[PDB]
Amino acid sequence: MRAKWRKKRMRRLKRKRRKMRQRSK
Amino acid sequence: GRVRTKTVKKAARVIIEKYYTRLGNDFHTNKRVCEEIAIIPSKKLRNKIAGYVTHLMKRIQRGPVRGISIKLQEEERERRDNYVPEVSALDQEIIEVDPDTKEMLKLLDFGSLSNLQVTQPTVGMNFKTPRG
Amino acid sequence: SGALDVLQMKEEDVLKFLAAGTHLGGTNLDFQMEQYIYKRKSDGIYIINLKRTWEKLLLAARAIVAIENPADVSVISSRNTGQRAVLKFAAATGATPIAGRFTPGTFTNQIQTAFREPRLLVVTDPRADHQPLTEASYVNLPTIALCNTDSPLRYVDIAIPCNNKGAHSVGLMWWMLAREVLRMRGTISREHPWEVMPDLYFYRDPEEIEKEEQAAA
Amino acid sequence: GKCRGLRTARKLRSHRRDQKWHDKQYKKAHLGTALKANPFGGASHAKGIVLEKVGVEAKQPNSAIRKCVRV
Amino acid sequence: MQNDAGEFVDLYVPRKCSASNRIIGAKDHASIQMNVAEVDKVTGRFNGQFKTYAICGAIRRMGESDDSILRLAKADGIVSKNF
Amino acid sequence: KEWLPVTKLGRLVKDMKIKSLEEIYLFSLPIKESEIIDFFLGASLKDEVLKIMPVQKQTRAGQRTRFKAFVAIGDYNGHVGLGVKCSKEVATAIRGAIILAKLSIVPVRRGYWGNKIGKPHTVPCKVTGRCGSVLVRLIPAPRGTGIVSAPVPKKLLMMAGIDDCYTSARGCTATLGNFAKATFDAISKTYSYLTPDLWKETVFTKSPYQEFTDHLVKTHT
Amino acid sequence: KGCEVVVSGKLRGQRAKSMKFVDGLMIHSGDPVNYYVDTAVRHVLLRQGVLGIKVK
Amino acid sequence: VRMNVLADALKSINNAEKRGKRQVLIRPCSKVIVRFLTVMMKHGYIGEFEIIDDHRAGKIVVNLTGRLNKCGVISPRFDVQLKDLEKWQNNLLPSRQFGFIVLTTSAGIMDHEEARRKHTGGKILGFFF
Amino acid sequence: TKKRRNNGRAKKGRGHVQPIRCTNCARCVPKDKAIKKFVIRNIVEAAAVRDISEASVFDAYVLPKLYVKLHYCVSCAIHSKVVRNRSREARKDRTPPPRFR
RNA sequence: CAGAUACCGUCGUAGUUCCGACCAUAAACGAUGCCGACCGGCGAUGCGGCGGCGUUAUUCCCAUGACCCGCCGGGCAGCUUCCGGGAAACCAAAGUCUUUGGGUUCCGGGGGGAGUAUGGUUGCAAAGCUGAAACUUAAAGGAAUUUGGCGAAGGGCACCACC
RNA sequence: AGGUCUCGUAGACCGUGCACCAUGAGCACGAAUCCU
Ligand SMILES: [Zn+2]
């Protein structure tokens, strides 16, 4: 795996973690 | 594919360098010489040697080759580079000389020689080729 | 080298220099050759000194007569321009000639039959014969060279500036070099003209060989 | 050795200090997390009680099972 | 080489070049001891006097040893002062 | 077991016209016969092996093994050398190694530490030798300290005859060939370092080949 | 003008290894192998195995 | 920008020494170079040196011979006492038989042996061997 | 590791050049990096020029040429046999190939 | 194609373009920080200046535009090198280095975890900067020589290959 | 007035993509010195 797509899946999981942060206060 | 190996070429080389006077362009005659002068274990190799000596005789008869040093053609080079001619082509009555070289010969140890003839200088120094 | 009032040119050596065209050089220069060259004239040909080259022939002659064994001077020419004058020089002075295809094992390979290691190494062109100098580097061997203005100066000890392109200039200066060697040796006189011919050192194309054969007897 | 001046030494102190904090043995030897993660608490030996025995397997070049206890 | 008594400790002293004045190693085979001749003062012939010169391998590989030998012979008195 | 020389230097040595290898190193003639040094150094020259190392080359069918041996020779009050030879079998490997070691030996100088009494014990000055990545530095030491280093330049300095030295190293000294060549560079550079002892202009004696080239040309052709 | 000795068997281990020591000139192919080369093959009875000798 | 004059002068003469030149053109003419080269002459390392003076920073012409190995400059100007000079000549000087460490003092500029004889220390300047 | 002293292009003190496209494909390639070919061509080759010659109105009528400039990417250059790889020691030769005919 | 929401072909929303308000990310790479001193050559190139034969704006003159022969200073670069350095590829700097010190800013200590969680901070949003620990592993990596395998290329060969 | 100007005739650089083409169970490897 190259670094670009693991950075992309990091961005996706960080986005969904921020969504669960805003929906789980 | 009929090419000669190194053994037959070296054998023909040494027997054509050491024996030349008792030879000839006829295949059978120098084949019998190859019988007489050299102990050969085979006969096909004998035919190979005799044919190659015949071919090298046809190569010698048009000019010298760079594999042998035969005494009949030897000392022809020595006579040809050992002659002396009458004129040396250097003690001429005319020597053609540039003005800057005249200024050089003015300053060495002479002032003017009686075999000294000058040219005019050139009009343009376009000497180097156009490359870019 | 010129310290005496006998060891100069009288009238004729500069005449032979003018006849052979030894004063004409190449267009490009070297960074070590500005002191051996007078100036630069028109049409891009460097004009060289003659006193300096005379001093270089005197120094090289002193180096040759310095050793006592005449067989310990190896003189090498691979180019065809001066390959015969090397043989005549070795015939006149007893030197060891190499003419054409200097094999890379004469100085450093011991098991070969052609194993030579003399006092003196004399060569005709450092530009063309870049090969024997690098092999003679590994033995304590000095180098006498016949240098042009475009020739690189490397593993050199005495650089004689000359015109090593025309065969007449080269054969003339080998004839003068042999003349100085026999003068300091004492075989020939210093004032009596011993000149057998200078034509014995000149090389020429085989077309002119055939032309001279048909023109002469 | 980069800074060569007669009155620059606090810069060298701060540089050596930060570059010492960028270590590994000095990082573990001067933090409470590395000492508190040690189950011994910086002790040579410790006592305990055994609950059950667990048989763990070895690594793939050397195939065996090693007898161990859970303390 | 000497001591408080006075004997020379070193087995030999290595040569230095007369132009370079740096020492030459034991395995520097490019360093040479070139020898020139001296001429008689009236007749112009060899007599037997030698002027041995030495040059290092670094300048010889550089190729500027020829002017060094020229300067050495000028200081010796071989090459003409006009030149 | 007689000797037939192939060089003119070997012939002049066999004509007993060389007293010692001192003037041979002084004029720096190339030594290319191993039997000349054997003729010079007799019972005082002994050796010991350093390492036998396997070197393998992969070909079409299997692997091709080839063994290289490092040996260090040396007389215990002077000249030492190092020789490496690589071959298939170990016997001609060690034979070519000791022969090539006898081909390349160098003279050394020993100096004093502060005061000048008796015979020397240590290097005259700080010399450094580099090859590959290894840094080898030899520093003079007082009398009676002894050679302190890594064990194999320690035993090489024991072959050197040097009694005391202070040594420091940098990099991978595990490569014993590179380490041995680096410390040989450090030892062999003891003449290529100008000191105030040799500041007079040296007198030039005649070359030995210049001295006996008449005998050589009357002996051989 | 040339000889060799070829040995094989169980030497200093459990795997079979062969050692050959050549010196000089030796001819493989053709008729002149018949009246110039003499070959002897023998079995050596050691303790750990049987060893072979090849001499030409 | 030119900061230390003696460092540039010693670097230039050291480079021309290792290359093999005989005549060296040192760009500035500060008097510390003059004192350093007088120490070098009376030590016997180099020969004669010239000085070209004008209405600006003139040049230095130094005649070289093959008797100098390396001259260096310690920067910045460290303070060396008489009790600590032996550690400096241990970690800096190549041998105890030769090599000299110049230093500036209140009684002038000289090598280390004159400083030990006259019992005075000062700041460091450089070294040569 | 480093393969060339340059980087397959002609940018030394510039930083950016205007990119162009290819001819065989449509790959966007910078100008100094792209291999460019400019071959002079005829409309008809040496078999049809005679049938132009005697079957024409005007005698000695000189035939016009085909001047077109081609720019290739390096992949389609090597694949269509425009440039060929050489050895590492023989890579350092900037002269064009000789034109015997 | 077995499967093709991929390679290919036809349409095609946002975007690609300009104005204005924003984020400050790249293989933003000469993967080589800034200033200054020193140590070899050669041949062209761009600017400004200097000297000199001749040709041309048609035949005489002046300096000019265009040249040719050379020089100076700055700049992009090129070839060879036993200066020197390095693990080597290579570098006229990546040199002047155990013989280690010209002045100065930032930055890295095996490989993952991880540029991750948390804390701070800026933004409309996307996100940017600062930034761990626990735990696991004896390897992860750089240069280069030799057989290997290329749906890589050049010369040939084989009725155990083809026509 | 003569009535085929002379000297040898690489005189082939016509062309560009090219169908679909995946995977391989681990056990099975050893490093050296000289004479009597
Ligand atoms: Zn394309």
Report in angstroms the alpha-carbon separations of B52 from B9, B18, C56.
Answer: 7, 15, 53
- Helix (H) / strand (E) element for F25: namely helix F22-27
Roughly what angle, to the nearest 10 degrees, separates helices H5-19 and H31-43? 40
Question: Any idea which fold F8-106 has?
Answer: Double Stranded RNA Binding Domain (3.30.160)
Secondary structure of residue H101 in the 3-state scheme: strand
Q: What is the DSSP string of D1-68?
A: -----TT--HHHHHHHHHHHHS-SHHHHTT-HHHHHHSTTSS-S-------EEEEEE--TTS--EEEE
Q: How many CB atoms lie within 10 A of CB F217?
A: 14
User: Which of these, H40, H16, H38, lies nearest to H27 by C-alpha position?
Assistant: H16
Q: What's the number of CA atoms in the CB half-sphere (13 Å) around residue F30?
A: 19
The C-alpha R_g of chain I, in whole angstroms, comes to: 19
Q: Is C14 on the interface with B (CB under 8 A)?
A: yes
Write the Ramachandran bin of C94: left for phi over 0, alpha for psi from -120 to 50, otherwise beta.
left
The DSSP code sequence of I39-75 is EEEESS-TTTHHHHHTSSSSTT-PPPEEEEEEEE-HH
Domains of chain C: total: 1
Neighbours of H62 (CB within 10 A): 25
By C-alpha distance, which of H40, H59, H42, H48 is closest to H22?
H48
Break chain H into its structural domains and give their ranges: 1-68, 69-129
Distance separating alpha carbons of residues E77 and H4, to the nearest angstrom: 45
Residue C78 is part of which domain span?
13-217
Residue C1 lies in a domain: no
Ligand 1 centroid – CA B115 distance (Å): 73
Nearest alpha-carbon partner for E60 in E17, E9, E8: E17
Say if H77 is an interface residue toward chain D (CB within 8 Å). yes
Q: Is H45 exposed, middle or buried (0-12, 13-18, 19+ CB in 10 A)?
A: buried
Tell whether C4 is covered by a domain: no
**Cβ within 8 Å, pair C140-F217:** no
**Experimental determination technique:** cryo-EM
Spatial CB neighbours of B51, under 8 Å, sequence gap ≥ 6: B27
Identify the CA nearest to F141 among candidates F118, F110, F171, F117.
F110
**Residue showing tokens 């030495």:** E54
Nearest CA in chain E to C62: E37
Tell me which chain D residue has its CA closest to the CA of residue H77. D6
CATH label, H1-68, candidates 3.40.630.40, 1.20.1250.20, 3.40.50.300, 3.30.1370.30:
3.30.1370.30
For the domain with range H69-129, which CATH number is right: 3.30.365.10, 3.30.1490.10, 3.40.50.1970, 3.90.1310.10? 3.30.1490.10
CATH number at residue E2: 3.30.1230.20
C-alpha torsion angle, residues A19, A22, A23, A24 (rounded to 10)? 110
CA to C1' distance (Å), from C34 to J62:
39
Distance CA G44, CA G51 (A): 5
Where are the alpha helices (H) located in C5-76, listed in sequence order?
13-20, 51-66
Answer whether G29's CB lies under 8 Å from G10's CB: no
What is the bridge-based pairing of β-strands E32-39 and E46-55?
A: antiparallel
* Enclosing domain of residue I86: 1-101
Nearest to E80 by CA among F85, B116, C54: C54
CB H86 within 8 A of CB H53: no
CATH superfamily of domain region B6-61:
Ribosomal protein S17 (1.10.60.20)
Phi, psi torsion values for C13, nearest 5 degrees: -70, -40
Estimate in Å the CA H58 to C1' J51 gap, whole number: 30
The reply to whether C99 touches chain B by the CB within 8 Å rule is: no
Report yes or no: B15 and B34 within 8 Å, Cβ to Cβ.
yes
Preceding omega of H76 cis (within 30 degrees of 0): yes
Identity of the residue in F6, F210, F214 whose CB atom sits nearest the CB atom of C110 = F6
- Where in G1-56 does DSSP place strands (E)? 2-10, 16-24, 40-45, 50-55
Residues 72-101 of chain F within 7 A of strand K, judged by CB, are: 90-91, 94
Work out the burial of residue H33: count CB atoms within 10 Å of its CB; fewer than 13 is exposed, 13-18 middle, 19 or more buried: buried
* Segment (H or E) for G46: none
Sheet holding F80-87, edge to edge: F45-58, F63-75, F80-87, F105-106
